[PDB]
Symmetry: C2
Subunit: 155 residues, 2 copies
Amino acid sequence: EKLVVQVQQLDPVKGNKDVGTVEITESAYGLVFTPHLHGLAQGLHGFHIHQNPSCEPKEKDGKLVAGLGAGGHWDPKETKQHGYPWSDNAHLGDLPALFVEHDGSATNPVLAPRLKKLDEVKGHSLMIHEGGDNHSDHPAPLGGGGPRMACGVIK
Amino acid sequence: EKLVVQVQQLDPVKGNKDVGTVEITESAYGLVFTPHLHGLAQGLHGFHIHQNPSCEPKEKDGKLVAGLGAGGHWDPKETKQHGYPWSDNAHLGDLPALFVEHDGSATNPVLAPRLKKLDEVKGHSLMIHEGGDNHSDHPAPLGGGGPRMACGVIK
Ligand SMILES: [Cu+2]
Ligand SMILES: [Cu+2]
Ligand SMILES: [Cu+2]
Ligand SMILES: [Cu+2]
Ligand SMILES: [Zn+2]
Ligand SMILES: [Zn+2]
């Protein structure tokens, strides 16, 4: 009847810290992602489900870049393109952008109409990027979210 | 096909300001509302379809109140409750909250899964509130939206 994702802000060098959680429920129109995050940068952020059920980084050129353990966006239907949460051409893991209040709190729930059961999302990660999401691979790849600001494993 | 709603920032004393449009299109999972608004107050705002095809103010106790001519939330199924966009117990006009960037712009689209055809929404109004939306009538009625900030007639 529910799923509570332990969301933590990413940081390879010093350490991961718990920013709150995200509960995933089923509605008659798809999975609902309701967060109770506190202490994040304000604004709209890219919100997507990734491949590997891990939130640990991967260094490159010495410079460790957070969240790479998660891999790319979850794409079991191999569309090979980033898009809208309501488009069949998009990665199945593409969710609506997440809003973080002026006080760093995320409490506005979003719907992923293409996901029906809680089981589908298990064994994958939940990523929250630094930038937004224009739901296209242009002008920037993967909606332009960029650096991975927060993450959590869906168990 | 597409419906282009001309939206105005409401001000009965100084005069309304043209702030952009909201395009309504049909997706495989419901109606998509794509804004391109400018000059609005930043933050998360209540976003709903109201009964009457009007954005006119009405006088109440000596002063004009912005947008009262739009009537209440569109409720064809007569649920009598304000709720979530994915709940069948909520007014059919209940849409996901609209995010306005720190620069006053709104460009992030939202989905109303319970609405399927463009014609359904014609003959009504699209309202953007000063306050937010918790998708319940408690603690504040109609999700806590409060005053009517911007509005457009759906033709
Ligand atoms: Cu809290
Ligand atoms: Cu991502
Ligand atoms: Cu513009
Ligand atoms: Cu309203
Ligand atoms: Zn994607
Ligand atoms: Zn309502």
